[PDB]
mmCIF file of C-alpha atoms in Angstrom:
data_model
loop_
_atom_site.group_PDB
_atom_site.id
_atom_site.type_symbol
_atom_site.label_atom_id
_atom_site.label_comp_id
_atom_site.label_asym_id
_atom_site.label_seq_id
_atom_site.Cartn_x
_atom_site.Cartn_y
_atom_site.Cartn_z
ATOM 1 C CA UNK A 1 253.449 10.538 -54.704
ATOM 2 C CA UNK A 2 250.471 12.638 -53.596
ATOM 3 C CA UNK A 3 248.999 14.866 -56.310
ATOM 4 C CA UNK A 4 246.612 17.802 -55.933
ATOM 5 C CA UNK A 5 243.761 17.355 -58.420
ATOM 6 C CA UNK A 6 241.247 20.183 -58.094
ATOM 7 C CA UNK A 7 238.274 18.189 -59.442
ATOM 8 C CA UNK A 8 237.876 15.589 -56.688
ATOM 9 C CA UNK A 9 234.259 15.928 -55.491
ATOM 10 C CA UNK A 10 233.394 17.073 -51.979
ATOM 11 C CA UNK A 11 230.185 15.417 -50.811
ATOM 12 C CA UNK A 12 227.853 17.489 -48.645
ATOM 13 C CA UNK A 13 226.231 16.545 -45.326
ATOM 14 C CA UNK A 14 227.733 13.039 -45.298
ATOM 15 C CA UNK A 15 229.849 13.661 -42.187
ATOM 16 C CA UNK A 16 229.141 13.690 -38.478
ATOM 17 C CA UNK A 17 225.663 14.927 -37.632
ATOM 18 C CA UNK A 18 224.883 15.373 -41.320
ATOM 19 C CA UNK A 19 226.849 18.629 -41.439
ATOM 20 C CA UNK A 20 230.468 17.772 -42.225
ATOM 21 C CA UNK A 21 231.764 17.387 -45.780
ATOM 22 C CA UNK A 22 233.343 14.092 -46.867
ATOM 23 C CA UNK A 23 236.032 13.882 -49.548
ATOM 24 C CA UNK A 24 237.727 10.860 -51.157
ATOM 25 C CA UNK A 25 241.452 10.206 -51.609
ATOM 26 C CA UNK A 26 242.511 7.558 -54.128
ATOM 27 C CA UNK A 27 245.733 5.558 -53.719
ATOM 28 C CA UNK A 28 246.526 3.769 -56.982
ATOM 29 C CA UNK A 29 249.178 1.308 -58.079
ATOM 30 C CA UNK A 30 249.610 -0.648 -61.296
ATOM 31 C CA UNK A 31 246.444 -1.669 -63.165
ATOM 32 C CA UNK A 32 244.075 0.804 -61.495
ATOM 33 C CA UNK A 33 241.958 2.079 -64.412
ATOM 34 C CA UNK A 34 241.279 0.946 -67.974
ATOM 35 C CA UNK A 35 240.490 3.250 -70.899
ATOM 36 C CA UNK A 36 239.231 1.724 -74.149
ATOM 37 C CA UNK A 37 239.444 3.885 -77.288
ATOM 38 C CA UNK A 38 237.299 2.790 -80.223
ATOM 39 C CA UNK A 39 237.757 6.239 -81.796
ATOM 40 C CA UNK A 40 239.878 9.125 -80.544
ATOM 41 C CA UNK A 41 238.643 12.707 -80.320
ATOM 42 C CA UNK A 42 238.002 14.234 -83.745
ATOM 43 C CA UNK A 43 236.582 17.517 -85.020
ATOM 44 C CA UNK A 44 234.042 18.025 -87.808
ATOM 45 C CA UNK A 45 232.403 21.053 -89.408
ATOM 46 C CA UNK A 46 229.038 21.509 -91.090
ATOM 47 C CA UNK A 47 227.001 24.208 -92.831
ATOM 48 C CA UNK A 48 223.255 24.713 -92.368
ATOM 49 C CA UNK A 49 220.481 26.907 -93.777
ATOM 50 C CA UNK A 50 221.973 27.625 -97.213
ATOM 51 C CA UNK A 51 225.378 28.182 -95.625
ATOM 52 C CA UNK A 52 224.068 30.717 -93.103
ATOM 53 C CA UNK A 53 224.868 28.709 -89.949
ATOM 54 C CA UNK A 54 228.258 27.162 -89.195
ATOM 55 C CA UNK A 55 228.582 24.267 -86.757
ATOM 56 C CA UNK A 56 231.678 22.734 -85.179
ATOM 57 C CA UNK A 57 231.486 19.393 -83.397
ATOM 58 C CA UNK A 58 233.847 17.217 -81.372
ATOM 59 C CA UNK A 59 233.357 13.440 -81.395
ATOM 60 C CA UNK A 60 234.784 10.407 -79.641
ATOM 61 C CA UNK A 61 234.112 6.739 -78.943
ATOM 62 C CA UNK A 62 235.697 5.550 -75.708
ATOM 63 C CA UNK A 63 235.082 4.319 -72.180
ATOM 64 C CA UNK A 64 236.819 4.610 -68.799
ATOM 65 C CA UNK A 65 236.310 1.911 -66.174
ATOM 66 C CA UNK A 66 237.740 1.186 -62.739
ATOM 67 C CA UNK A 67 239.236 -2.308 -62.787
ATOM 68 C CA UNK A 68 237.369 -4.521 -60.308
ATOM 69 C CA UNK A 69 237.593 -8.307 -60.047
ATOM 70 C CA UNK A 70 235.540 -10.915 -58.243
ATOM 71 C CA UNK A 71 236.723 -12.698 -55.120
ATOM 72 C CA UNK A 72 234.020 -15.309 -54.469
ATOM 73 C CA UNK A 73 232.760 -18.557 -55.975
ATOM 74 C CA UNK A 74 231.315 -16.874 -59.054
ATOM 75 C CA UNK A 75 233.201 -14.957 -61.711
ATOM 76 C CA UNK A 76 231.237 -11.770 -60.926
ATOM 77 C CA UNK A 77 230.888 -12.517 -57.197
ATOM 78 C CA UNK A 78 232.220 -10.398 -54.263
ATOM 79 C CA UNK A 79 233.961 -7.567 -56.191
ATOM 80 C CA UNK A 80 237.257 -6.011 -55.035
ATOM 81 C CA UNK A 81 238.922 -2.911 -56.468
ATOM 82 C CA UNK A 82 241.971 -4.303 -58.277
ATOM 83 C CA UNK A 83 244.624 -1.707 -57.540
ATOM 84 C CA UNK A 84 242.719 1.139 -55.819
ATOM 85 C CA UNK A 85 242.509 2.064 -52.127
ATOM 86 C CA UNK A 86 239.776 4.578 -51.291
ATOM 87 C CA UNK A 87 239.880 6.778 -48.209
ATOM 88 C CA UNK A 88 237.016 8.951 -46.950
ATOM 89 C CA UNK A 89 237.968 11.957 -44.821
ATOM 90 C CA UNK A 90 236.406 15.146 -43.481
ATOM 91 C CA UNK A 91 237.002 18.645 -44.839
ATOM 92 C CA UNK A 92 235.943 22.219 -44.107
ATOM 93 C CA UNK A 93 235.853 23.125 -47.797
ATOM 94 C CA UNK A 94 232.819 24.075 -49.821
ATOM 95 C CA UNK A 95 231.045 21.045 -51.243
ATOM 96 C CA UNK A 96 231.353 20.418 -54.976
ATOM 97 C CA UNK A 97 228.317 18.089 -54.786
ATOM 98 C CA UNK A 98 225.026 19.186 -53.242
ATOM 99 C CA UNK A 99 223.274 17.246 -50.490
ATOM 100 C CA UNK A 100 220.516 16.029 -52.818
ATOM 101 C CA UNK A 101 223.017 14.644 -55.335
ATOM 102 C CA UNK A 102 225.315 13.227 -52.632
ATOM 103 C CA UNK A 103 222.670 11.372 -50.615
ATOM 104 C CA UNK A 104 222.083 7.669 -51.192
ATOM 105 C CA UNK A 105 219.873 6.995 -54.211
ATOM 106 C CA UNK B 1 234.523 31.579 -53.427
ATOM 107 C CA UNK B 2 237.109 34.389 -53.514
ATOM 108 C CA UNK B 3 236.852 36.105 -50.096
ATOM 109 C CA UNK B 4 238.516 34.852 -46.902
ATOM 110 C CA UNK B 5 237.672 36.282 -43.468
ATOM 111 C CA UNK B 6 240.243 35.925 -40.703
ATOM 112 C CA UNK B 7 240.619 32.269 -39.761
ATOM 113 C CA UNK B 8 237.735 31.281 -42.048
ATOM 114 C CA UNK B 9 234.701 32.689 -40.241
ATOM 115 C CA UNK B 10 231.582 34.546 -41.322
ATOM 116 C CA UNK B 11 228.492 33.689 -43.352
ATOM 117 C CA UNK B 12 227.716 34.665 -46.932
ATOM 118 C CA UNK B 13 224.901 37.153 -46.313
ATOM 119 C CA UNK B 14 226.240 40.443 -44.903
ATOM 120 C CA UNK B 15 229.682 41.979 -45.369
ATOM 121 C CA UNK B 16 229.350 44.185 -42.283
ATOM 122 C CA UNK B 17 228.362 41.195 -40.143
ATOM 123 C CA UNK B 18 231.291 39.199 -41.539
ATOM 124 C CA UNK B 19 233.735 42.017 -40.769
ATOM 125 C CA UNK B 20 232.237 42.282 -37.272
ATOM 126 C CA UNK B 21 233.512 38.729 -36.650
ATOM 127 C CA UNK B 22 237.171 39.788 -36.976
ATOM 128 C CA UNK B 23 238.945 40.018 -33.617
ATOM 129 C CA UNK B 24 242.513 41.084 -32.899
ATOM 130 C CA UNK B 25 243.478 37.884 -31.047
ATOM 131 C CA UNK B 26 242.643 35.057 -33.470
ATOM 132 C CA UNK B 27 241.839 36.725 -36.823
ATOM 133 C CA UNK B 28 245.301 37.918 -37.858
ATOM 134 C CA UNK B 29 247.237 37.113 -41.041
ATOM 135 C CA UNK B 30 249.391 33.994 -40.687
ATOM 136 C CA UNK B 31 250.383 30.855 -42.583
ATOM 137 C CA UNK B 32 246.956 29.322 -41.947
ATOM 138 C CA UNK B 33 245.215 32.369 -43.430
ATOM 139 C CA UNK B 34 247.528 32.344 -46.453
ATOM 140 C CA UNK B 35 246.853 28.636 -46.999
ATOM 141 C CA UNK B 36 243.118 29.295 -46.766
ATOM 142 C CA UNK B 37 243.388 32.056 -49.364
ATOM 143 C CA UNK B 38 245.383 29.749 -51.654
ATOM 144 C CA UNK B 39 242.656 27.134 -51.184
ATOM 145 C CA UNK B 40 240.030 29.712 -52.152
ATOM 146 C CA UNK B 41 242.065 30.549 -55.258
ATOM 147 C CA UNK B 42 242.484 26.890 -56.250
ATOM 148 C CA UNK B 43 238.920 25.738 -55.469
ATOM 149 C CA UNK B 44 236.825 28.506 -57.043
ATOM 150 C CA UNK B 45 234.685 27.297 -59.944
ATOM 151 C CA UNK B 46 235.978 30.004 -62.340
ATOM 152 C CA UNK B 47 239.567 28.897 -61.674
ATOM 153 C CA UNK B 48 242.055 31.683 -60.935
ATOM 154 C CA UNK B 49 244.807 31.485 -63.535
ATOM 155 C CA UNK B 50 248.193 31.203 -61.778
ATOM 156 C CA UNK B 51 250.843 33.818 -62.467
ATOM 157 C CA UNK B 52 253.273 31.128 -63.644
#
């Protein structure tokens, strides 16, 4: 089941000749991602400056991680993506990520 | 992010120069042009709200 998610990044100047745009496609089965929730999203309100300023805040304690497991002698050895297949393809679309941010660190 | 020219040609500097790139043979309105316009609608940063 292929799903159109508009917020998949398009990396710039990572294609042929440093001009084409490269985009990822993620094929996922069972046990692909793990989300830990220590505290769900909550809202709080506060007053400042003798009740002159009003502040609203949203708070959460959580973490999202791609499940990867080792495949070598050590526990954390050669790591493989447990349940995710990544494909890199070329596109003509405008890049969501600039060349500076997309280049290797 | 909201303007489509022909088959997807033209730079982002001059409107007259972009319109001067439209020829009668390959820059007509077809399914490819409609799909490109839908892509422009769905990929613009200030997302276009769909009718339904």
